[PDB]
mmCIF file of C-alpha atoms in Angstrom:
data_model
loop_
_atom_site.group_PDB
_atom_site.id
_atom_site.type_symbol
_atom_site.label_atom_id
_atom_site.label_comp_id
_atom_site.label_asym_id
_atom_site.label_seq_id
_atom_site.Cartn_x
_atom_site.Cartn_y
_atom_site.Cartn_z
ATOM 1 C CA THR V 1 52.038 130.362 -35.490
ATOM 2 C CA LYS V 2 50.753 133.585 -34.242
ATOM 3 C CA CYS V 3 50.673 131.919 -31.007
ATOM 4 C CA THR V 4 54.221 131.298 -31.165
ATOM 5 C CA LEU V 5 55.679 134.301 -32.290
ATOM 6 C CA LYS V 6 53.021 136.363 -29.612
ATOM 7 C CA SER V 7 52.813 138.575 -32.627
ATOM 8 C CA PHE V 8 49.496 139.737 -34.738
ATOM 9 C CA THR V 9 52.061 140.830 -37.896
ATOM 10 C CA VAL V 10 54.134 137.501 -38.978
ATOM 11 C CA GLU V 11 56.881 138.090 -41.618
ATOM 12 C CA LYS V 12 57.941 135.963 -44.624
ATOM 13 C CA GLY V 13 59.574 132.754 -43.551
ATOM 14 C CA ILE V 14 59.366 129.129 -42.096
ATOM 15 C CA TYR V 15 58.482 129.026 -38.651
ATOM 16 C CA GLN V 16 58.641 125.372 -36.569
ATOM 17 C CA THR V 17 55.203 125.515 -34.605
ATOM 18 C CA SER V 18 54.857 122.520 -32.749
ATOM 19 C CA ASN V 19 55.132 118.603 -32.977
ATOM 20 C CA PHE V 20 53.009 115.604 -33.726
ATOM 21 C CA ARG V 21 53.051 112.060 -32.611
ATOM 22 C CA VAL V 22 50.611 109.249 -33.775
ATOM 23 C CA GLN V 23 49.065 107.910 -31.057
ATOM 24 C CA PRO V 24 48.556 104.121 -30.036
ATOM 25 C CA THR V 25 45.674 102.601 -31.398
ATOM 26 C CA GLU V 26 45.258 99.599 -29.042
ATOM 27 C CA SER V 27 46.498 97.473 -25.994
ATOM 28 C CA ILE V 28 47.553 94.058 -26.056
ATOM 29 C CA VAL V 29 46.731 92.212 -22.877
ATOM 30 C CA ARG V 30 50.166 92.149 -20.977
ATOM 31 C CA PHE V 31 50.385 88.669 -20.776
ATOM 32 C CA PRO V 32 53.038 85.916 -20.546
ATOM 33 C CA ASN V 33 51.133 82.521 -21.350
ATOM 34 C CA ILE V 34 50.196 80.186 -18.459
ATOM 35 C CA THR V 35 50.097 76.035 -18.281
ATOM 36 C CA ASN V 36 49.254 75.139 -14.910
ATOM 37 C CA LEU V 37 47.581 75.712 -11.417
ATOM 38 C CA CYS V 38 47.963 74.003 -8.468
ATOM 39 C CA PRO V 39 45.715 71.371 -6.382
ATOM 40 C CA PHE V 40 42.297 72.598 -5.540
ATOM 41 C CA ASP V 41 39.936 69.915 -6.901
ATOM 42 C CA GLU V 42 42.185 67.419 -4.603
ATOM 43 C CA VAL V 43 41.304 69.473 -1.776
ATOM 44 C CA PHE V 44 37.651 70.013 -2.481
ATOM 45 C CA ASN V 45 36.767 67.384 -4.356
ATOM 46 C CA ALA V 46 38.537 65.130 -1.704
ATOM 47 C CA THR V 47 36.707 61.523 -1.141
ATOM 48 C CA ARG V 48 37.041 61.440 2.561
ATOM 49 C CA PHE V 49 37.470 64.332 5.094
ATOM 50 C CA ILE D 1 25.452 51.768 -12.767
ATOM 51 C CA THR D 2 25.122 47.965 -13.041
ATOM 52 C CA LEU D 3 24.972 45.254 -10.628
ATOM 53 C CA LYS D 4 25.044 41.758 -11.076
ATOM 54 C CA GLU D 5 25.110 38.744 -8.852
ATOM 55 C CA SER D 6 26.654 35.342 -8.843
ATOM 56 C CA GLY D 7 27.587 32.244 -6.915
ATOM 57 C CA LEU D 8 25.957 28.792 -6.237
ATOM 58 C CA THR D 9 22.152 28.953 -6.665
ATOM 59 C CA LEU D 10 21.877 25.212 -5.452
ATOM 60 C CA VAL D 11 23.690 24.000 -2.126
ATOM 61 C CA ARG D 12 22.833 21.290 0.306
ATOM 62 C CA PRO D 13 21.694 21.838 3.857
ATOM 63 C CA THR D 14 23.958 22.444 6.559
ATOM 64 C CA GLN D 15 26.438 23.968 3.709
ATOM 65 C CA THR D 16 27.234 27.842 2.915
ATOM 66 C CA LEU D 17 25.738 29.992 0.589
ATOM 67 C CA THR D 18 28.155 32.675 -1.204
ATOM 68 C CA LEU D 19 27.169 35.397 -3.507
ATOM 69 C CA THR D 20 29.423 38.045 -5.413
ATOM 70 C CA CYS D 21 27.811 40.949 -6.661
ATOM 71 C CA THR D 22 29.935 42.298 -9.179
ATOM 72 C CA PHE D 23 28.945 46.105 -10.416
ATOM 73 C CA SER D 24 30.209 48.772 -12.885
ATOM 74 C CA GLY D 25 29.692 52.722 -12.624
ATOM 75 C CA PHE D 26 30.717 53.365 -9.153
ATOM 76 C CA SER D 27 33.446 52.666 -6.793
ATOM 77 C CA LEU D 28 33.306 51.997 -3.201
ATOM 78 C CA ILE D 29 36.432 54.629 -2.408
ATOM 79 C CA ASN D 30 34.039 57.694 -2.970
ATOM 80 C CA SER D 31 31.881 58.982 0.185
ATOM 81 C CA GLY D 32 28.792 57.953 0.563
ATOM 82 C CA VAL D 33 29.093 54.772 -1.375
ATOM 83 C CA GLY D 34 27.989 51.628 0.029
ATOM 84 C CA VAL D 35 26.585 48.409 -0.880
ATOM 85 C CA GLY D 36 24.184 45.980 0.861
ATOM 86 C CA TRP D 37 22.303 42.745 0.156
ATOM 87 C CA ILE D 38 18.651 42.107 0.633
ATOM 88 C CA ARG D 39 16.840 38.825 0.317
ATOM 89 C CA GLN D 40 12.887 38.140 -0.621
ATOM 90 C CA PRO D 41 11.658 34.672 -0.110
ATOM 91 C CA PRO D 42 9.439 33.225 -2.698
ATOM 92 C CA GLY D 43 5.898 35.096 -2.079
ATOM 93 C CA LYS D 44 7.021 36.628 0.969
ATOM 94 C CA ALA D 45 8.234 40.326 2.061
ATOM 95 C CA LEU D 46 11.775 41.723 1.364
ATOM 96 C CA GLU D 47 14.577 41.002 3.884
ATOM 97 C CA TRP D 48 17.786 42.742 4.888
ATOM 98 C CA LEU D 49 20.846 40.820 5.023
ATOM 99 C CA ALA D 50 23.912 43.210 5.396
ATOM 100 C CA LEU D 51 25.629 46.879 4.668
ATOM 101 C CA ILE D 52 29.166 48.431 4.102
ATOM 102 C CA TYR D 53 29.681 52.234 3.794
ATOM 103 C CA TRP D 54 32.786 53.490 2.082
ATOM 104 C CA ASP D 55 34.940 53.684 4.898
ATOM 105 C CA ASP D 56 33.970 49.799 5.685
ATOM 106 C CA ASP D 57 31.135 50.406 8.347
ATOM 107 C CA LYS D 58 29.550 46.610 8.457
ATOM 108 C CA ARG D 59 26.170 47.137 9.550
ATOM 109 C CA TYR D 60 24.205 43.795 9.721
ATOM 110 C CA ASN D 61 21.107 42.695 10.819
ATOM 111 C CA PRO D 62 21.058 41.966 14.275
ATOM 112 C CA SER D 63 18.398 39.152 14.073
ATOM 113 C CA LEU D 64 20.965 37.639 11.483
ATOM 114 C CA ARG D 65 24.216 38.320 12.764
ATOM 115 C CA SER D 66 26.558 35.583 13.820
ATOM 116 C CA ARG D 67 26.035 33.841 10.657
ATOM 117 C CA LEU D 68 26.894 36.478 8.023
ATOM 118 C CA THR D 69 29.768 37.419 6.632
ATOM 119 C CA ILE D 70 30.307 40.424 4.042
ATOM 120 C CA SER D 71 33.922 41.438 2.352
ATOM 121 C CA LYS D 72 35.141 43.296 -0.459
ATOM 122 C CA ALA D 73 37.412 43.089 -3.454
ATOM 123 C CA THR D 74 38.223 46.607 -4.585
ATOM 124 C CA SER D 75 40.481 45.772 -6.998
ATOM 125 C CA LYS D 76 38.036 43.384 -8.635
ATOM 126 C CA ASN D 77 35.008 45.891 -8.126
ATOM 127 C CA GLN D 78 33.330 43.197 -6.318
ATOM 128 C CA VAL D 79 31.537 42.427 -2.977
ATOM 129 C CA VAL D 80 31.078 38.974 -1.290
ATOM 130 C CA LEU D 81 28.788 37.564 1.130
ATOM 131 C CA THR D 82 28.804 34.404 2.779
ATOM 132 C CA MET D 83 25.991 32.836 5.147
ATOM 133 C CA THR D 84 26.692 29.418 6.722
ATOM 134 C CA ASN D 85 24.746 26.374 7.367
ATOM 135 C CA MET D 86 22.165 26.705 4.839
ATOM 136 C CA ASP D 87 18.359 25.683 5.719
ATOM 137 C CA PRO D 88 15.330 24.915 3.425
ATOM 138 C CA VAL D 89 13.818 28.107 4.843
ATOM 139 C CA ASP D 90 16.836 30.272 2.999
ATOM 140 C CA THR D 91 15.323 29.445 -0.487
ATOM 141 C CA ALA D 92 14.939 32.967 -1.909
ATOM 142 C CA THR D 93 16.119 35.444 -4.347
ATOM 143 C CA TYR D 94 18.862 37.454 -3.348
ATOM 144 C CA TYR D 95 19.496 41.014 -4.715
ATOM 145 C CA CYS D 96 22.466 43.280 -4.351
ATOM 146 C CA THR D 97 21.752 46.802 -3.846
ATOM 147 C CA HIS D 98 23.558 50.051 -3.907
ATOM 148 C CA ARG D 99 23.451 53.226 -1.736
ATOM 149 C CA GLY D 100 24.917 56.308 -2.736
ATOM 150 C CA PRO D 101 24.357 59.627 -2.302
ATOM 151 C CA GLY D 102 21.858 62.372 -3.520
ATOM 152 C CA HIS D 103 21.177 65.900 -3.269
ATOM 153 C CA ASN D 104 21.099 66.473 0.373
ATOM 154 C CA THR D 105 21.207 63.055 2.232
ATOM 155 C CA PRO D 106 22.278 59.675 1.225
ATOM 156 C CA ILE D 107 20.515 57.469 -0.662
ATOM 157 C CA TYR D 108 19.841 53.967 0.295
ATOM 158 C CA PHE D 109 19.258 50.872 -2.097
ATOM 159 C CA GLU D 110 18.538 53.099 -5.371
ATOM 160 C CA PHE D 111 20.043 50.471 -7.682
ATOM 161 C CA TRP D 112 19.002 46.500 -7.209
ATOM 162 C CA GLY D 113 20.787 43.733 -8.943
ATOM 163 C CA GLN D 114 19.120 41.199 -11.137
ATOM 164 C CA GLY D 115 18.389 38.644 -8.196
ATOM 165 C CA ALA D 116 19.837 35.005 -7.752
ATOM 166 C CA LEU D 117 17.479 32.187 -6.861
ATOM 167 C CA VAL D 118 18.881 30.155 -4.320
ATOM 168 C CA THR D 119 17.544 27.037 -3.236
ATOM 169 C CA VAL D 120 18.539 24.809 -0.155
ATOM 170 C CA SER D 121 17.667 21.294 -0.786
ATOM 171 C CA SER D 122 18.899 17.851 -2.270
#
């Protein structure tokens, strides 16, 4: 409170010193959900080149 | 991987021998894979008949060429060998063998059949 009022003597009263905000505790993988790829086991495991 | 031969085991002279190797465990559509035939008379050394790679490269025993015809029925997973003008010297055991891939080089004759005793007599 002294720091806000910049004064070594604070008088009787109520002062709004600061704010608080609960911090995030976690991160949740940022993802949509997949399902399928493309043809790779059909270009590298090909029978005849 | 299993192989099994079938056909006529007894045939008259001046007739034709036919054999069918029906297999299980591999397909003649992959790379490497091929199927061959090897005969051995009773009490003699082995003998090579014919060979067919996966891309249909029909190698034959030269000395035994002009008499043999090998063909495939891939749908039926079977190979057919045919030799015309059979003779009493052709009494032997006939194995059908399989040549597949290895780890750095193609394998040849890794698997054998169970034989089909062929007698040419009357």
